[PDB]
Structure formats: structure tokens, C-alpha cells
Amino acid sequence: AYDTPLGITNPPIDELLSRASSKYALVIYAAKRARQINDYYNQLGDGILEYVGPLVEPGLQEKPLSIALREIHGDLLEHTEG
Amino acid sequence: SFREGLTVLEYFINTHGARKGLADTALRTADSGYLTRRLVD
Amino acid sequence: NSVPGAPNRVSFAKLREPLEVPGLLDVQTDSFEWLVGSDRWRQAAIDRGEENPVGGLEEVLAELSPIFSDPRFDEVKASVDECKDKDMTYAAPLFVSQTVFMGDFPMMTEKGTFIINGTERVVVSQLVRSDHFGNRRLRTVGELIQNQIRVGLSRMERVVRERMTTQDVEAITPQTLINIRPVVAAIKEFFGTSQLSQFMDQNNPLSGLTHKRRLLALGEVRDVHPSHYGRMCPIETPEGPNIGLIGSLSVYARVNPFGFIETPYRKVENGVVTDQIDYLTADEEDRHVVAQANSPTDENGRMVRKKGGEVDYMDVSPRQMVSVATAMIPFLEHDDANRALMGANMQRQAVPLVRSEAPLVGTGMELRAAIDAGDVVVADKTGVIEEVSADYITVMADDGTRQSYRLRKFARSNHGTCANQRPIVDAGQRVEAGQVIADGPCTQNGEMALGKNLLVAIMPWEGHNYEDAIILSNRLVEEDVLTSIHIEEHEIDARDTKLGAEEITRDIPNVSDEVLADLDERGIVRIGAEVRDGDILVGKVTPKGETELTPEERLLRAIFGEKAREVRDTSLKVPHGESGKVIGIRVFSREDDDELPAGVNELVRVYVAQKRKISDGDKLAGRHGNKGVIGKILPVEDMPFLPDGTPVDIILNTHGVPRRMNIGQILETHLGWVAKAGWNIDVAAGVPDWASKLPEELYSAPADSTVATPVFDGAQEGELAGLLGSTLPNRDGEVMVDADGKSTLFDGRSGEPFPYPVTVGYMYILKLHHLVDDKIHARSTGPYSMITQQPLGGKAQFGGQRFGEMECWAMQAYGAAYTLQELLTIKSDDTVGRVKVYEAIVKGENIPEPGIPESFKVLLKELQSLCLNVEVLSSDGAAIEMR
Amino acid sequence: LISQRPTLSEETVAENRSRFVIEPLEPGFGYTLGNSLRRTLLSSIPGAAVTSIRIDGVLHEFTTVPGVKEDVTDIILNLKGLVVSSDDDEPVTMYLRKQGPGVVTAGDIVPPAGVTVHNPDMHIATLNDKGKLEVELVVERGRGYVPAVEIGRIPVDSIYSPVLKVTYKVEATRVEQRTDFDKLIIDVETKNSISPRDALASAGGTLVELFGLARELNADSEHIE
Numbered sequence A: 001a002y003d004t005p006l007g008i009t010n011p012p013i014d015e016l017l018s019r020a021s022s023k024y025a026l027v028i029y030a031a032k033r034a035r036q037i038n039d040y041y042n043q044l045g046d047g048i049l050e051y052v053g054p055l056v057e058p059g060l061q062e063k064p065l066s067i068a069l070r071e072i073h074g075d076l077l078e079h080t081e082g
Numbered sequence B: 001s002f003r004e005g006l007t008v009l010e011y012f013i014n015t016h017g018a019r020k021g022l023a024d025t026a027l028r029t030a031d032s033g034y035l036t037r038r039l040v041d
Numbered sequence C: 001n002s003v004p005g006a007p008n009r010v011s012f013a014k015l016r017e018p019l020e021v022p023g024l025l026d027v028q029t030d031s032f033e034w035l036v037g038s039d040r041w042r043q044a045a046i047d048r049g050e051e052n053p054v055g056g057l058e059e060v061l062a063e064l065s066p067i068f069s070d071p072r073f074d075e076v077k078a079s080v081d082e083c084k085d086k087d088m089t090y091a092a093p094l095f096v097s098q099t100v101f102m103g104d105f106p107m108m109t110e111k112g113t114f115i116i117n118g119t120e121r122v123v124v125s126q127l128v129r130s131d132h133f134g135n136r137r138l139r140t141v142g143e144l145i146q147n148q149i150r151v152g153l154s155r156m157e158r159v160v161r162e163r164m165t166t167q168d169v170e171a172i173t174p175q176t177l178i179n180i181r182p183v184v185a186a187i188k189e190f191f192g193t194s195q196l197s198q199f200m201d202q203n204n205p206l207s208g209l210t211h212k213r214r215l216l217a218l219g220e221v222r223d224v225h226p227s228h229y230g231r232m233c234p235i236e237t238p239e240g241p242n243i244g245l246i247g248s249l250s251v252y253a254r255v256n257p258f259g260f261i262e263t264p265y266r267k268v269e270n271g272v273v274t275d276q277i278d279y280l281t282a283d284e285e286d287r288h289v290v291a292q293a294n295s296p297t298d299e300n301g302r303m304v305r306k307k308g309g310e311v312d313y314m315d316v317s318p319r320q321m322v323s324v325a326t327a328m329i330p331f332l333e334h335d336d337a338n339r340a341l342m343g344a345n346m347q348r349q350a351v352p353l354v355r356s357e358a359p360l361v362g363t364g365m366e367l368r369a370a371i372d373a374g375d376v377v378v379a380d381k382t383g384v385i386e387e388v389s390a391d392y393i394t395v396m397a398d399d400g401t402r403q404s405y406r407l408r409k410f411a412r413s414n415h416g417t418c419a420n421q422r423p424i425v426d427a428g429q430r431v432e433a434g435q436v437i438a439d440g441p442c443t444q445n446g447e448m449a450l451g452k453n454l455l456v457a458i459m460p461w462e463g464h465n466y467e468d469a470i471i472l473s474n475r476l477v478e479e480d481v482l483t484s485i486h487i488e489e490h491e492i493d494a495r496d497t498k499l500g501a502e503e504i505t506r507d508i509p510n511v512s513d514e515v516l517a518d519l520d521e522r523g524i525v526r527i528g529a530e531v532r533d534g535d536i537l538v539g540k541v542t543p544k545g546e547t548e549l550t551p552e553e554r555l556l557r558a559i560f561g562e563k564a565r566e567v568r569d570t571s572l573k574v575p576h577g578e579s580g581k582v583i584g585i586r587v588f589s590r591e592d593d594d595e596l597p598a599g600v601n602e603l604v605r606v607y608v609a610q611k612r613k614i615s616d617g618d619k620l621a622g623r624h625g626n627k628g629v630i631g632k633i634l635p636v637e638d639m640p641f642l643p644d645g646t647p648v649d650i651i652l653n654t655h656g657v658p659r660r661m662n663i664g665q666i667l668e669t670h671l672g673w674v675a676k677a678g679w680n681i682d683v684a685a686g687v688p689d690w691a692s693k694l695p696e697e698l699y700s701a702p703a704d705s706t707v708a709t710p711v712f713d714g715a716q717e718g719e720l721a722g723l724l725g726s727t728l729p730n731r732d733g734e735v736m737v738d739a740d741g742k743s744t745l746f747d748g749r750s751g752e753p754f755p756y757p758v759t760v761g762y763m764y765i766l767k768l769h770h771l772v773d774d775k776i777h778a779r780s781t782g783p784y785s786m787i788t789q790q791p792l793g794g795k796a797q798f799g800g801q802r803f804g805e806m807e808c809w810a811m812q813a814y815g816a817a818y819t820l821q822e823l824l825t826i827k828s829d830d831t832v833g834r835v836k837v838y839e840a841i842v843k844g845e846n847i848p849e850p851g852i853p854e855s856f857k858v859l860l861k862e863l864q865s866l867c868l869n870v871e872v873l874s875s876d877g878a879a880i881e882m883r
Numbered sequence D: 001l002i003s004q005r006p007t008l009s010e011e012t013v014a015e016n017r018s019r020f021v022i023e024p025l026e027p028g029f030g031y032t033l034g035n036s037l038r039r040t041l042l043s044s045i046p047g048a049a050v051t052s053i054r055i056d057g058v059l060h061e062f063t064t065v066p067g068v069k070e071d072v073t074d075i076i077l078n079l080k081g082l083v084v085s086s087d088d089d090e091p092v093t094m095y096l097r098k099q100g101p102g103v104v105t106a107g108d109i110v111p112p113a114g115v116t117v118h119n120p121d122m123h124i125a126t127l128n129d130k131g132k133l134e135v136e137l138v139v140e141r142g143r144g145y146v147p148a149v150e151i152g153r154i155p156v157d158s159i160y161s162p163v164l165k166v167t168y169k170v171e172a173t174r175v176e177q178r179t180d181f182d183k184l185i186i187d188v189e190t191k192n193s194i195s196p197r198d199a200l201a202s203a204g205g206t207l208v209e210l211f212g213l214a215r216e217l218n219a220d221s222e223h224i225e
């Protein structure tokens, strides 16, 4: 085991890299999803779009980027690379 | 090995070489940054 | 020693100092006095010199006449203090058929400085060649000033030649032909802008002392030369890319009439030291073989430098090659030149502490260096004190004369360091001439006190004193031992402008009565008021053009009945991150005639002081080049403490790796404990063999005794361990340190002792000018430059950090394309980007896509101006423009 | 004087392992009482353990015991793990004697009235063919950990205290205006004779009682809430 992660180090990058191609794809992967979540808490997505998530049970005041990372860790979303 | 202490003349000679290391170290950093830029370039 | 009120500081010197240290402030005075041609110089030179000496200006006219003679010099216009206050130049007008006034002539203070426009400047002597080392000439302050006058006079004669031809003969006079503008403008153009004219570096008395005496080497080339022995100090030079170019003068160095430095030498004849000390220039040095200072002389009477090489005349003493700053490092012979140079530089970087404690283990220069710096009050004539007050001191000399000395009280120095003088004498005290009456900023009882004596333990403490970090006891904060006052000066001006005249008034456009609560009736902060970051110091108002206000603002104007005032707000607030009390206010008005630059009506300056507790992050250092920041400050409870319960003050890790050494530091630490606890050799059946070389006086010494170990002639290893053996116990008689200088310390947290004995002692550390309060910067949003829309460091503060080219490389290395783009666009040059980002952040929306950085847009414009038709072509959009 | 209400929280690591936290403490009370707690839990809780034992067949033989796979040394280490609560106070001599090939698992030892073994599944030894083993072992209550000090009598190290391993660490929390408030973390692994919670109460009770000697000098002083 790896004991337990504290804050930013959770979830581990290794368990997250299995969900995407490279560490870079992981970035855009969670980045755009964070933009999606924060739109949901606001009025999203203006015209013709409806925000989705949070798929996982959000923390107390968890940051949307921190939510998109847990969602990717649980395979709750799939992505396609261009 | 300065444990015994150096007399007046002994310390003068030591400065002749010690100052070359500080000046020579000034040229080590400049060119390395000028080389690293061309490398990156 | 040899000074009247000198404190008792025993010395380990095995050699007598034959020649007293010369007035190490003479290099500046002699040259300027020779320049002006004072009667004291003529009287001093005539006694043992040419009977017809010519002053610098007198010599200038001698060569110029016939085309001028007998130039006059009236008494100084205003006093030094009066000049520094009114921001004028300490000068005395000079005069020269038709009489002519040539202009106000700057004058040199007793401290060897000049007041040029209210600031205390110091001219640096230049060492130019008259090839070989001895070929160096060395221009003195007075001489290189005269040369600047030559240019003024000569070009003045070039104007008179042209004027007399066109002008009618007999219809012109010296006044009509002489246009002294290039003369007065030549000296004003020197003391200012000139590279040899510099603002006196004075955050401690020693810094200003070494600023003078310091010389330039050029008019390979940086390397020291055999000739530099006893003349220029090779151990003192900047660490930056100016090594060798700059050097401070040696202690006993004396300059000859021309400028060729001379060194004191005692000619040795028949193997017996002759007390006759003669001047031997660089060239004259080779004529007679020079002997080494440290020489075996047995009782009464009794390795030498060859004429051109190494290893007739004997050296006057050790440390001839050493300078004042270098000669104040105890155990200098043990530290490497690098650390010694580092040590000297950091000694002049110390700050004056409120208490100013003298070093427990010092050398010899402390007393001489302090009184010669000029920052200590000296009694000119023997006598008795009549009054002693915090404001002034008066002495009733037996002669009958009556001298008084006004004390600098909380006077701001050139870099905000407080200079406060303390009287050390009482009412009935009988004082001798040349004695010390009041202590300067970094002085105690007459000798330099640049730091404090602290209890040290050289053990690594749970990683908090890692690499070069340091941990301190909270006692240094509670007892204000490392607390130093710092004064700041702020200024504002009211002048005439394009469309109106500025008016400094209390009434501010849009403000509450609370923010103006601490302002006076005129609008300036009241004395003694506490000012936080952003508070108003002076309320100034300047005319604003056509309002053309926003309707959304006019509506609220009528709603709340606040008439849109006429002009704009221009108040002087405290810079971000600053705070303190207001000490004084200086108001210079126009109604009150005064004298301000054309257009200026009123000029006021506020002085703010700050009591800086020694804070984690500040930079401390000893005299041996050892430096480091304060990594943590533990409460006195959880701190390694001796069996007495006496907590240690600072915990220093073992910085000195093998070979690196830094041996000198370890020595003064042990001696520090010796001097703090006294000693007694307990002589029984003679004295130990190690004390044989010692002179009687250091045999017995009480607790807290000060010691002096001159640089090369100081205490020796054997003598040390002996003093380690003798240590007077504390109350109860227990012993705290063994013969190894170690003690079993108790961890103030666990309570259990540290398994091994730890080295403890007293080391003299300094507080360096690098301070956290001055170096901490943070910025969310702030001002932006005009030409380039990049974040500009506002004069208040909020300066942005630079993301240089190299950092960009590191950002590209990570592949963080977005972070890089973010830095070079919305965080800087994006005119509409950074505003929409701030907007998006406040609302909580996503951050928008970056735009075009203004830098790039400016680039295209620069190209077009160069006639380069550049077009940002789209994939299918042909040409495009920014707009 | 009044403090800021430090609390006592407990997180259970295992059945006999739990960590505790006190939040927040005033700088720097974390280390003050911390080391004293670990010292009190470890060497101030009463408990019974084995003092000395004698095994039939080994009087001058040092290395081996015939008919048993475990050597002399290895056999002792097993018995050291024996946890038994004895309220008799004085040294009681229990007896364990099993024959024939098998596994002696403590449950075979007949405890005299007043002593109770708490780990009946403990593996003491393995038995060889047609082999018997009679073991006599002394058990007297004690405190902390007393090292080891008649023919064939072997003194053994005595693990008197129920607490087996204790460690503590400190951190900083409670921002507010001052962010250097102490948080005390203590880690205690206990044997099944008593729970980690009870061990803390005993250690805490003995401390307050021990520090009551300075309080009795004057109960009017200010101290803290």
C-alpha cells in the first residue's frame, strides 16, 4: 500500500494515468471537466447546453478540479482524443 | 589546514590564488548561460 | 590602550604596537585641505617640507596666470545640519582690476564628507598610473577635484578669448568677459553624476568609515600584487563582478604629497629593530630588504620580502596589509580569505541595535575604529562636565572655555538606519581630552558594537537549522536584544501644473471621517500617530480638467446630495507592507518665503519610524563570513538548556564541512565562554608550559571580561585549552562546560538530555540589512506601465515578479502550455484579458480564453515603422489587423 | 485564566490499536505533556506478566530441548507474548504439561485461581513424537518493562505493561489569527488485556494524581481553566 494521500496528492497519479493516454491527456481530461462542473453550479451552459455532474458525492467545499480528478479515478467518464 | 595559524606573509600568498577562483567562477556562469541559450535555440 | 577613557580589554598580543594607528580619516582631509590650501597644511608642510607650498587652486592659477590670483573663501553659508535640513549644498563662495565671484565652493566636513544638495556624499580616491604595481599614482580627493577645476578654468579662458575679439576694447571688463557658468557647472557636474562621487554608505559607523579610504584600482588586473603589502587590503573587495577593481586602504597606509601611497617601515640595522619609522614608497621598498612582522625577538632587541620576489627594514607591526574592517575579525589568521572577505563585507552590513552591546571577544580596532568614524562624541579639551542631558552635554574645561555637544537623537541615516547617540558620562565626571562622551549608533563605551553576544550550541536540531538556517530563542524578541529601529522618509510637493496649482489640503474628495481622523487641520498626519498600510500621510489635491463624469455616477450624486467636487484626489499614503509611528514633519511653504524649485508652493516630508523585532527570515551572520536566515524561533521553554536551566540563544548546525573549515568561528565561540565565565589558572609550583608565552594580566580574570586578540598576534591553541580548563562555576558551584568546550544539554521538549555532549559558547553575531519586512512582496492586481502594458511596480508597491526567458524554458520543459500562455498574456500584456479574468474570478465563472499580448502588437508596429510590411495572414482570411 | 477548549478524539486503527488527537493545544503544550503521556502509558499501568520459568530437562543444557521443534531461545519469545491478568500481586506458579505429538497453545496451561490468560490461541510450542513437556512459569504483577536478572531456573525479560508500542507526533492547526497552535497525535498499540481507551484513562488518572502533589501546595493559584 501507499498509506493515504493528503489533499492534492489524492488520487495518485499512477491510478489516474491508467484512465488516459499520457499525463498531458490527463490534464485536459480533468481540466475541461472542471469547467463543466463549475458551469453546472452556475447557469450552464447559457444557450443550448446543460451541465452534468458532479457525478461523485462532492466534498464539503471541494474544488471542481478536485472533483473531476475523483470522477476520472472511478472511470465515471470516458474521453476521446483527437 | 589553518589550525596552527598563518603569519603575515603566509596569508598574503594565499590571497593571490584565492582571488583567481572567484574571478574564474564569474566566467563559468556567463558562458554556461550563453551556451544553454544556443542549445535551447 | 593609549586613549584616555579607553575601556579595559586585555590583549593576547606578544608584540608591542610601536606606531599608533594614524588618523584613518586623513586620506580625505589631507587631500581637500591641500586643495583649499588651509593654513594648517602650510604650517604642517613647512615644518618638514618645502617652504613655498602651493595650494591646489593656487597652483591652478599659477599655471593659468598670466591669462587671476589671490582667491578668497568666505565662511560657510550654513551649517552641515542646516544644509542637510534645507536640502542645500555645504559650500563656501570663492572670489578672485575687476573682482569676480566664481561660485559657491563645496566644503568637506570634519568626517571627510560633502553635503551636495542636502545629502552626505563621499569622494572615493582613485588609483591611476603615473604597468608595474608601483607605477600606480592614486589620486586623492583634493587632487582629482582640482583636475575638474582645470577643465572649468581652461574652457572659461576659451570663452574670454572669443568675447574680447568681438567686444569693443576698453569697453569690456573682467566681469563682462568672464562667464563663470562652465566653472560652477563643472563642479556641480562632478559632485553629482560623477562615478567617484558617491552617497555615503552609512548603516553602521564602520560602513561609512570604509566607504572613505576605499580606492579604485584601474583608471590579471584584478590579481593582488606584492606591492599591495601594507598599502591596499587584498582581503577586502566586493563579491560581485567587481573583485580586484575596488579595494580599501590599509590601516597604517600614508599618502605622500603627490599621491603615491607610502607604508610605515622601521629600518632594521645589525639585527636590532630601530624605532625610526620612515616612509618607503613601492619603489623605495625594493631598495632595502623588508623583514616580517612576526619575528623572534628575545628580550631587549633581537623570512623577508625580496626587492622583486618573496621570502634592512622591519615592518611596523602585523595587519599592515589588513584594513580596518578586516583587522576587526578575531582569529583572522585561521579563516580562509573567502570567508574573511565575506566577514568584512558583512560587518559593514550590520544594523544599529537599540541596545548596542560591545563584542565580548574582540580585537583591537574596535576602540580606534569607532572614535575615528566620526559617529561618536569626543571631548576636545580636558575638564569636567557641567550638564548631562539627553539633548546635549556641556564640559567646563580647566582652561575656562565652555564647549557643548548636541546629540543626534533618532536621526535617519541614508538607508533608514536610526542613528541615536547615548551619553556615557555623568555630572561631576572629570574627562580628559580625546575621551568618549557619548556612544554612537553601533558603539558601546567607545568601541564598535555591531552585534550582540549570544549563547550558541553547535548541534543539529531536528532539521530546523538545516544547511545555513538558524534557530533563535524567543528571548531575543522578548528582551529586544536584536531589535533595531528603522526610519523612513516620505515626501510630497505642491507646485503649479498645466491647468492649475496643486493644493495640499485636508479635505479629500471621496473619504470617510475615520480615514481622515488622524490628519491635522492642514491635512498632514499628526505627530505620534500610528499609520497602517494605505493610511493617508498628507492630503494633496490637484485640479482636474473637464469632469465629463459618468451618468451612473451623477445619479448617485443627486440621490445622496454629494456635489461632484471640482478636482481630483492626490494623497500620499503609506507604501503597501509598511507601518510605524510618525516621528517628525517638515513643512516648507511658499507664503513662508523659504526656497523651493520654480512652481513649488509647499513642500512637506513625513518621517516614519519602526521598531523591528528580530523576525524569522531575517539574515544574521558572524565576523567570519558565516551567514544564514532565521529558520525558526522556539519559545525559551523548548530549547536546549544547560544544567543551570540556562537556555541557549541560537542553535547553529555544523556548516563547516571538512576542508571548508571556517575554523575562526569555533575559536571565538570557546573564548566567548571563557570571557563570559572568567578563569583562574590555579598556578601551583609554577605556571603551565602553555602560559609561558602569555603575559601576566590574563592569568586571572573575572566573569564577563572583554578580551582582545589582534588579528595575526592573538591567542594561540595551547593558551586556549588552558583557559578552557579554568572556568569559574555558576551559583552553587556546578560546572557548565568542560575542557572540550562541550556540555550535556537537555532537550527542552522531551525533557531528556541529548546523548552526547554538545559544544556551547558565546559568539558575536550581527543583524544584516537584508530584512524580511523589506523583501516580502505580493501582488494580485496593480499598476501597469504606459508604453508596455506589463504590470509595473507601483511606487507605493505591488510590483509584479518577472517571468524571465529561462523560466519560460522550464515551463516548456514540463509541457504546461496553458500555464505558460496564462503567464505571458492574461497575467501581463492582455489589455482586455486581465480585466475579464479578474471579473470572471469575482463572479466565480470560468477564466476566459487569452487574447493578444500587447507586446506582440507593439512588435508589429515597430516593424512597420522600420518599413517592414508585415501581415498576420490567416489560414484562409488573407490579411488581418489587431485594432 | 481560560483556554480555548481542547478536545480529545480517538480513531481506531485496529482491534487493539488506536490513535488519539488533542486539538487545539496552546504553543507549545504539544511536547510538554506529550512525552509525559507516552512515558506514563508505557511504565505506569499495572499488569501481570511472566518473571521466570523452568522447563524439565534443561538445567545445564543451553541450546536445545529434546522432543520439541522450537529451541530454548525461540520457546521463551513465545511465552513472553503470553498475556495473563493476575490480581494475586505475589508470584504465582502456573503449570503447563502436555504429552504426545501436538501443538501446545497456552490453553493447555492450567492457570491457578486468580490468574486468567487472555490469548488461549497463542502458539507456545510444537510437540514431537511420543514427547511430553512439563513447563513451570512464575507470574507476578508489575509495571513497565523490567529486564531479566536454583538449578535450571531461567529469568526472562518481563513485559509488565499492557501497552506494547506508543509513539506521538505534533502538528499545527487552528488558523484563526495564530496558525502555530499545537495538535497532539499519540499512537498506542495495546494487548487484549485492556483496551487503548482504558489505558489512556489510567495513564491520565495517574498523571493528574501525580501532579496533584504540586497543586496541594496551593489550590488558589491561577493556573488555567
Ligand SMILES: C/C(=C\[C@H](C)CCCCC(=O)O)[C@@H]1O[C@@H]2C=C[C@@H]1OC(=O)\C=C/C=C\C=C\[C@H]1O[C@@H]3C[C@H]1O[C@@H](/C=C/C[C@H]1O[C@H](C[C@H](O)[C@H]1C)[C@@H](O)[C@@H](O)/C=C/CC/C=C/C2)[C@@H]3C
Pocket: C124, C194, C195, C196, C197, C198, C199, C200, C201, C207, C210, C211, C212, C214, C215, C216, C237, C238, C239, C240, C242, C246, C348
Ligand atoms: C561599481 C562602482 C560603484 C557602485 C555604485 C558601488 C560599488 C559596488 C561594489 C559593492 O558594493 O560590492 C564603482 O565606483 C567608483 C567608480 C566606478 C564604479 O562605478 C560603477 O560602475 C557604477 C556607479 C558609480 C557611482 C554611482 C553614484 C550614484 O549611484 C547611487 C547614488 C550615487 O552613489 C552610489 C552610492 C554608492 C555607495 C556604495 O558603497 C558601498 C556599499 C553599497 O554598494 C553602496 C552604498 C560600501 O561598501 C562602500 O564601502 C564601497 C564603495 C565602492 C568604492 C568604488 C569606487 C570607484 C548609489 C548607487
